[PDB]
Amino acid sequence: ARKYFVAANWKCNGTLESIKSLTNSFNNLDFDPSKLDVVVFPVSVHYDHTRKLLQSKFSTGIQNVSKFGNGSYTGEVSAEIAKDLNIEYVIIGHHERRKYFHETDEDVREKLQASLKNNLKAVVCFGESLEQREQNKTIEVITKQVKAFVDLIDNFDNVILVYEPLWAIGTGKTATPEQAQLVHKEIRKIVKDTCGEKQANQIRILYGGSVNTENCSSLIQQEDIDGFLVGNASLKESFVDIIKSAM
Amino acid sequence: RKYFVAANWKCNGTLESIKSLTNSFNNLDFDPSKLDVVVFPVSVHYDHTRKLLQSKFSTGIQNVSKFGNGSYTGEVSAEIAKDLNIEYVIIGHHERRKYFHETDEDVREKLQASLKNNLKAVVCFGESLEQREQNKTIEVITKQVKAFVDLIDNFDNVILVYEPLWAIGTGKTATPEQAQLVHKEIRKIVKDTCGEKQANQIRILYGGSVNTENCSSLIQQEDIDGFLVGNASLKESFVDIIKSAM
């Protein structure tokens, strides 16, 4: 059975003081890390502070990684550097980076390749827009996005997929847990056909739409939803209840 | 003007190499009231680097968000930098303009965010080989500088960097004389846009290839106030580059 995977994407939020308060509350939750993956993704400059405050039961990662290796790439953080610091996970292809920083499918591929080369675990995001869904292009879009990078996966425990329903993020539309489930099943089928049956049954596929204390249980109970990449709710002490839903 | 020597480590370093390097740096006795010496490590290396370096060394980061706090996965806001007392930011480095399509408008917005949050900004610009061969150096640099220069309200807090892109990875070499002329041109641009007192106050650093051999010939130029140093700043011999400014 697939190990559930609950992730906190803090995005560009936090102070030293707020993180101290939040991590303390997180540490009060007793869970078994051998049965459940719980991963926190602070801002890069907060990583050291965050890692030191969180008990080891929480895994940690960064919100982005360079497509380039070490060298003359001012402002970038390489996979090699992340590995040397024992940073376990990286987020790749978050829709915000695709949107504001024009990250492409090829950038995502190259980031994944670098991450795996340096023995990092990767949380890889993709998903279709409102226009794409309205044109009935969900499967076509996700197929292309997944096929951009899927052949790079060797160990299907170490790459975790995230479906972001962009059509339901800042559009006024909302995704039901069932509608998420339908796409998740479709994603798993794509992995099945591009990679293999065993591989597909192994891979974690997370929901990356709006997740809160009220809807997390309805989401996690869906057969092909293996967890979540959680936004604003993960900046709240009540995030522990979101973790509880996967326990 | 107070000389300014900056180590741009770019995307380089390990916990162990930084331990070794910062230790060698600490061995240099300099007066931080006489010259600024700023180290720019990778974001995830900032805490390690700040802790290891003695208080005489200033520190910064190699990039900052044009956006504030919020839903900008992967970005570091000026607000976050301020909360950590990260003193300096590099803005507009040609590598970010090249690989990440950072624009003049991006540079302006990043400068604005930085100043709003009391960050000191090291702002980079420079012309390509094609632009120089077409005698567009002044035109190009004027446009790049004018993208942001009206935001400077304190001329100690913004530091300019001329990157001779025409002499970076092209096989071409910039002489200290050539660098000085551009710096002179840049200071005149700042005079035209901000005033004489302001132009005479602002640091303008050389961002071309700087090493232990050439550093003195560059900093002794009238309008070159220091450097943003690249791979030479990953060496223990970087102390000798600092010495050229002492």
UniProtKB/Swiss-Prot annotation, chain B:
The active site is at residues 93, 163. Belongs to the triosephosphate isomerase family. Pathway: Carbohydrate biosynthesis; gluconeogenesis; Carbohydrate degradation; glycolysis; D-glyceraldehyde 3-phosphate from glycerone phosphate: step 1/1. One of its GO terms (cellular component) is cytosol. NCBIfam families: tim. PANTHER family: TRIOSEPHOSPHATE ISOMERASE (PTHR21139:SF2). GO terms for molecular function: identical protein binding; triose-phosphate isomerase activity. Its EC number is 5.3.1.1. The gene is TPI. Catalyzes the interconversion of glyceraldehyde 3-phosphate and dihydroxyacetone phosphate in the glycolytic and gluconeogenic pathways. InterPro entries: Aldolase_TIM, TIM_sf, TrioseP_Isoase_bac/euk, Triosephosphate_isomerase, Triosephosphate_isomerase_AS. D-glyceraldehyde 3-phosphate binds at residues 8, 10, 169, 228, 230-231. This is Triosephosphate isomerase. GO terms for biological process: gluconeogenesis; glyceraldehyde-3-phosphate biosynthetic process; glycerol catabolic process; glycolytic process. Pfam families: TIM. It is an enzyme of class 5 (isomerase). Keywords: Gluconeogenesis, Glycolysis, Isomerase. CDD domains: TIM. SUPFAM superfamilies: Triosephosphate isomerase (TIM). PROSITE patterns: TIM_1, TIM_2. HAMAP family: TIM_B.
